[PDB]
Coordinates of N, CA, C and O in Angstrom, one line a residue:
Chain A
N1 N 0.8 -1.2 0.0 CA 0.0 0.0 0.0 C 0.9 1.3 0.0 O 0.4 2.3 -0.5
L2 N 2.1 1.2 0.6 CA 3.0 2.3 0.5 C 3.4 2.5 -0.9 O 3.4 3.7 -1.4
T3 N 3.8 1.4 -1.6 CA 4.2 1.6 -3.0 C 3.0 2.0 -3.9 O 3.2 2.6 -5.0
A4 N 1.8 1.7 -3.5 CA 0.6 2.2 -4.2 C 0.4 3.7 -4.0 O 0.1 4.4 -4.9
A5 N 0.6 4.2 -2.7 CA 0.6 5.6 -2.5 C 1.6 6.3 -3.3 O 1.3 7.2 -4.0
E6 N 2.9 5.9 -3.1 CA 4.0 6.6 -3.8 C 3.7 6.5 -5.3 O 4.1 7.4 -6.0
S7 N 3.2 5.3 -5.8 CA 2.8 5.2 -7.2 C 1.8 6.4 -7.5 O 2.0 7.0 -8.6
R8 N 0.8 6.6 -6.7 CA -0.1 7.7 -7.0 C 0.6 9.0 -7.0 O 0.3 10.0 -7.8
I9 N 1.7 9.2 -6.2 CA 2.5 10.4 -6.4 C 3.2 10.4 -7.8 O 3.2 11.5 -8.4
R10 N 3.6 9.3 -8.2 CA 4.4 9.2 -9.5 C 3.6 8.5 -10.6 O 4.3 8.0 -11.5
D11 N 2.3 8.3 -10.4 CA 1.5 7.8 -11.5 C 1.6 8.7 -12.7 O 1.8 9.9 -12.6
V12 N 1.6 8.1 -13.9 CA 1.3 8.8 -15.2 C 0.1 8.2 -15.8 O -0.1 7.0 -15.8
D13 N -0.8 9.0 -16.3 CA -1.9 8.6 -17.2 C -1.3 8.7 -18.6 O -1.4 9.6 -19.3
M14 N -0.5 7.6 -18.9 CA 0.2 7.5 -20.2 C -0.7 7.8 -21.4 O -0.3 8.2 -22.4
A15 N -2.0 7.4 -21.2 CA -3.0 7.8 -22.2 C -3.1 9.3 -22.3 O -2.9 9.9 -23.4
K16 N -3.3 10.0 -21.2 CA -3.4 11.5 -21.2 C -2.0 12.0 -21.6 O -1.9 13.0 -22.4
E17 N -1.0 11.5 -21.0 CA 0.3 12.1 -21.1 C 0.8 12.0 -22.6 O 1.4 12.9 -23.1
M18 N 0.5 10.9 -23.2 CA 0.8 10.7 -24.7 C -0.1 11.6 -25.5 O 0.3 12.1 -26.5
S19 N -1.4 11.7 -25.1 CA -2.3 12.6 -25.8 C -1.9 14.0 -25.8 O -2.2 14.7 -26.8
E20 N -1.3 14.5 -24.7 CA -0.9 15.8 -24.6 C 0.5 16.0 -25.2 O 0.9 17.1 -25.6
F21 N 1.3 14.9 -25.2 CA 2.5 15.0 -26.0 C 2.2 15.2 -27.5 O 2.7 16.1 -28.1
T22 N 1.3 14.4 -28.0 CA 0.7 14.6 -29.3 C 0.2 16.0 -29.5 O 0.6 16.7 -30.4
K23 N -0.7 16.4 -28.6 CA -1.4 17.6 -28.8 C -0.4 18.8 -28.8 O -0.5 19.7 -29.6
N24 N 0.6 18.8 -27.9 CA 1.5 19.8 -27.8 C 2.4 19.8 -29.0 O 2.9 20.9 -29.5
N25 N 2.6 18.7 -29.6 CA 3.3 18.6 -30.9 C 2.4 19.3 -32.0 O 2.9 20.0 -32.9
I26 N 1.1 19.0 -32.0 CA 0.2 19.6 -32.9 C 0.2 21.1 -32.8 O 0.2 21.8 -33.8
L27 N 0.3 21.6 -31.6 CA 0.2 23.0 -31.3 C 1.5 23.7 -31.7 O 1.5 24.8 -32.1
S28 N 2.6 22.9 -31.4 CA 3.9 23.4 -31.9 C 3.8 23.6 -33.4 O 3.9 24.7 -33.9
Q29 N 3.6 22.5 -34.2 CA 3.5 22.6 -35.6 C 2.6 23.6 -36.2 O 2.8 24.3 -37.2
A30 N 1.4 23.7 -35.5 CA 0.5 24.8 -35.8 C 1.1 26.1 -35.7 O 1.0 26.9 -36.7
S31 N 1.6 26.4 -34.5 CA 2.3 27.7 -34.3 C 3.4 28.0 -35.3 O 3.6 29.1 -35.8
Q32 N 4.1 26.9 -35.7 CA 5.1 27.0 -36.7 C 4.5 27.5 -38.0 O 4.9 28.5 -38.6
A33 N 3.4 26.8 -38.5 CA 2.7 27.3 -39.7 C 2.3 28.7 -39.6 O 2.4 29.5 -40.5
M34 N 1.9 29.1 -38.4 CA 1.5 30.5 -38.2 C 2.7 31.5 -38.3 O 2.6 32.6 -38.6
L35 N 3.9 31.0 -38.0 CA 5.1 31.8 -38.1 C 5.6 31.9 -39.6 O 6.0 33.0 -40.0
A36 N 5.5 30.8 -40.3 CA 5.7 30.8 -41.7 C 4.8 31.9 -42.3 O 5.3 32.8 -43.0
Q37 N 3.5 31.7 -42.1 CA 2.6 32.6 -42.7 C 2.7 34.0 -42.2 O 2.6 35.0 -42.9
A38 N 3.2 34.2 -40.9 CA 3.5 35.5 -40.4 C 4.7 36.1 -41.2 O 4.7 37.4 -41.3
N39 N 5.6 35.3 -41.7 CA 6.6 35.8 -42.6 C 6.0 36.1 -44.0 O 6.4 37.0 -44.7
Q40 N 5.0 35.3 -44.4 CA 4.5 35.4 -45.8 C 3.7 36.7 -45.9 O 3.8 37.3 -47.0
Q41 N 3.0 37.1 -44.9 CA 2.2 38.3 -45.0 C 3.0 39.6 -45.4 O 2.7 40.2 -46.4
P42 N 4.0 40.0 -44.6 CA 4.6 41.3 -44.9 C 5.4 41.2 -46.2 O 5.6 42.3 -46.8
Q43 N 5.9 40.1 -46.6 CA 6.5 39.9 -47.9 C 5.5 40.4 -49.0 O 5.8 41.2 -49.8
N44 N 4.2 40.0 -48.9 CA 3.2 40.5 -49.7 C 2.9 42.0 -49.6 O 2.7 42.7 -50.5
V45 N 3.0 42.4 -48.3 CA 2.7 43.9 -48.1 C 3.7 44.7 -48.9 O 3.3 45.5 -49.7
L46 N 5.0 44.4 -48.7 CA 6.0 45.2 -49.5 C 5.9 45.0 -51.0 O 5.7 45.9 -51.7
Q47 N 5.9 43.7 -51.4 CA 6.0 43.5 -52.8 C 4.8 43.9 -53.6 O 4.9 44.2 -54.8
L48 N 3.6 43.9 -52.9 CA 2.4 44.4 -53.6 C 2.3 45.9 -53.5 O 1.6 46.5 -54.3
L49 N 3.1 46.5 -52.6 CA 3.2 48.0 -52.6 C 4.6 48.5 -52.4 O 4.9 49.3 -51.5
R50 N 5.5 47.9 -53.2 CA 6.9 48.5 -53.3 C 6.9 49.4 -54.5 O 6.3 50.4 -54.6
Chain B
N1 N -3.3 -45.3 26.1 CA -4.1 -44.0 26.1 C -3.2 -42.8 26.1 O -3.7 -41.8 25.6
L2 N -2.0 -42.9 26.6 CA -1.1 -41.8 26.5 C -0.7 -41.6 25.1 O -0.7 -40.4 24.6
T3 N -0.4 -42.7 24.4 CA 0.0 -42.5 23.0 C -1.2 -42.1 22.1 O -1.0 -41.5 21.1
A4 N -2.4 -42.3 22.6 CA -3.6 -41.9 21.9 C -3.7 -40.4 22.2 O -4.1 -39.6 21.2
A5 N -3.5 -39.9 23.4 CA -3.5 -38.5 23.6 C -2.5 -37.7 22.8 O -2.8 -36.8 22.1
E6 N -1.2 -38.2 23.0 CA -0.1 -37.5 22.2 C -0.4 -37.6 20.7 O -0.1 -36.7 20.0
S7 N -1.0 -38.7 20.3 CA -1.5 -38.8 18.9 C -2.4 -37.7 18.6 O -2.3 -37.1 17.5
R8 N -3.4 -37.4 19.4 CA -4.3 -36.3 19.2 C -3.5 -35.0 19.1 O -3.9 -34.1 18.4
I9 N -2.4 -34.9 19.9 CA -1.6 -33.7 19.7 C -1.0 -33.7 18.3 O -1.0 -32.6 17.7
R10 N -0.6 -34.8 17.8 CA 0.2 -34.9 16.6 C -0.6 -35.6 15.5 O 0.0 -36.1 14.5
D11 N -1.9 -35.7 15.7 CA -2.8 -36.2 14.6 C -2.7 -35.3 13.4 O -2.5 -34.1 13.5
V12 N -2.8 -35.9 12.2 CA -3.1 -35.2 11.0 C -4.4 -35.8 10.4 O -4.5 -37.0 10.3
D13 N -5.3 -34.9 9.9 CA -6.3 -35.4 9.0 C -5.7 -35.3 7.6 O -5.9 -34.3 6.9
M14 N -5.0 -36.4 7.2 CA -4.3 -36.5 6.0 C -5.3 -36.2 4.8 O -4.9 -35.7 3.7
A15 N -6.6 -36.5 5.0 CA -7.6 -36.1 4.0 C -7.6 -34.6 3.9 O -7.5 -34.0 2.8
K16 N -7.9 -33.9 5.0 CA -7.9 -32.5 5.0 C -6.6 -31.9 4.6 O -6.5 -31.0 3.8
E17 N -5.5 -32.5 5.2 CA -4.2 -31.9 5.0 C -3.7 -32.0 3.6 O -3.1 -31.1 3.0
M18 N -4.1 -33.1 2.9 CA -3.8 -33.2 1.5 C -4.8 -32.3 0.7 O -4.4 -31.8 -0.4
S19 N -6.0 -32.2 1.1 CA -7.0 -31.4 0.4 C -6.5 -29.9 0.4 O -6.8 -29.2 -0.5
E20 N -5.9 -29.5 1.5 CA -5.4 -28.1 1.6 C -4.0 -28.0 1.0 O -3.6 -26.9 0.6
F21 N -3.2 -29.0 0.9 CA -2.1 -29.0 0.1 C -2.5 -28.8 -1.3 O -1.9 -27.9 -2.0
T22 N -3.4 -29.6 -1.8 CA -4.0 -29.4 -3.1 C -4.5 -28.0 -3.3 O -4.1 -27.3 -4.3
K23 N -5.4 -27.6 -2.4 CA -6.0 -26.3 -2.6 C -5.0 -25.2 -2.6 O -5.1 -24.3 -3.4
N24 N -4.0 -25.2 -1.7 CA -3.0 -24.2 -1.7 C -2.2 -24.2 -2.9 O -1.7 -23.1 -3.4
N25 N -2.0 -25.3 -3.5 CA -1.4 -25.4 -4.8 C -2.2 -24.7 -5.9 O -1.8 -24.0 -6.8
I26 N -3.5 -25.0 -5.8 CA -4.5 -24.4 -6.8 C -4.4 -22.8 -6.6 O -4.5 -22.1 -7.6
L27 N -4.4 -22.4 -5.4 CA -4.4 -21.0 -5.1 C -3.1 -20.3 -5.5 O -3.1 -19.2 -6.0
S28 N -2.0 -21.0 -5.3 CA -0.7 -20.6 -5.8 C -0.8 -20.4 -7.3 O -0.7 -19.3 -7.8
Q29 N -1.1 -21.5 -8.1 CA -1.2 -21.4 -9.5 C -2.2 -20.3 -10.0 O -1.9 -19.7 -11.0
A30 N -3.3 -20.2 -9.3 CA -4.2 -19.2 -9.7 C -3.6 -17.8 -9.5 O -3.7 -17.0 -10.5
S31 N -3.0 -17.5 -8.4 CA -2.4 -16.2 -8.2 C -1.3 -16.0 -9.2 O -1.1 -14.9 -9.6
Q32 N -0.6 -17.1 -9.6 CA 0.4 -17.0 -10.7 C -0.2 -16.5 -12.0 O 0.2 -15.5 -12.6
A33 N -1.3 -17.1 -12.4 CA -2.1 -16.7 -13.5 C -2.4 -15.2 -13.4 O -2.4 -14.4 -14.4
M34 N -2.8 -14.8 -12.2 CA -3.1 -13.4 -12.0 C -1.9 -12.5 -12.1 O -2.1 -11.3 -12.4
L35 N -0.7 -13.0 -11.9 CA 0.5 -12.2 -12.0 C 0.9 -12.1 -13.5 O 1.3 -11.0 -13.9
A36 N 0.8 -13.2 -14.2 CA 1.0 -13.2 -15.6 C 0.1 -12.1 -16.3 O 0.5 -11.2 -16.9
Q37 N -1.2 -12.2 -16.0 CA -2.2 -11.3 -16.5 C -2.0 -9.9 -16.0 O -2.2 -8.9 -16.8
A38 N -1.5 -9.8 -14.8 CA -1.1 -8.5 -14.3 C 0.0 -7.9 -15.1 O 0.1 -6.6 -15.2
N39 N 0.9 -8.7 -15.6 CA 1.9 -8.2 -16.5 C 1.3 -7.9 -17.9 O 1.7 -7.0 -18.6
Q40 N 0.3 -8.7 -18.3 CA -0.3 -8.6 -19.6 C -1.1 -7.2 -19.8 O -1.0 -6.6 -20.9
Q41 N -1.7 -6.8 -18.8 CA -2.6 -5.6 -18.8 C -1.8 -4.4 -19.2 O -2.1 -3.7 -20.2
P42 N -0.7 -4.0 -18.5 CA 0.0 -2.7 -18.8 C 0.7 -2.7 -20.1 O 0.9 -1.7 -20.7
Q43 N 1.2 -3.9 -20.5 CA 1.7 -4.1 -21.9 C 0.7 -3.5 -22.9 O 1.0 -2.7 -23.7
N44 N -0.6 -4.0 -22.7 CA -1.6 -3.5 -23.6 C -1.9 -2.0 -23.4 O -2.1 -1.3 -24.3
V45 N -1.8 -1.5 -22.1 CA -2.0 -0.1 -21.9 C -1.0 0.8 -22.7 O -1.5 1.6 -23.6
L46 N 0.2 0.5 -22.6 CA 1.2 1.3 -23.4 C 1.1 1.0 -24.8 O 0.9 2.0 -25.6
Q47 N 1.1 -0.2 -25.3 CA 1.2 -0.5 -26.7 C -0.1 -0.1 -27.4 O 0.0 0.3 -28.6
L48 N -1.2 0.0 -26.8 CA -2.4 0.5 -27.4 C -2.5 2.0 -27.3 O -3.3 2.6 -28.0
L49 N -1.7 2.6 -26.4 CA -1.6 4.1 -26.4 C -0.2 4.5 -26.2 O 0.1 5.4 -25.4
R50 N 0.7 4.0 -27.0 CA 2.1 4.5 -27.2 C 2.1 5.4 -28.4 O 1.5 6.5 -28.5

């Protein structure tokens, strides 16, 4: 029961933990796409009004 | 009658005693199956959500 308690201290919901690993990767890649596009916009600003 | 008394001190119900030898072996093997399966479950947890 002690190792069960300590387990609860150090439990992982590997389902959740992997799901948020996944999700945080999705959000990373998403934010990356947003930075690419953030670079794409002002390129257009200048080149369409240079 | 003395050896009968002392016999009662050291009697065995070999029927019961063998029956519980048997039973405790059954319960051993059962618990073993439960440990195998206890190993089988988290294998599935990770591999189905790795």
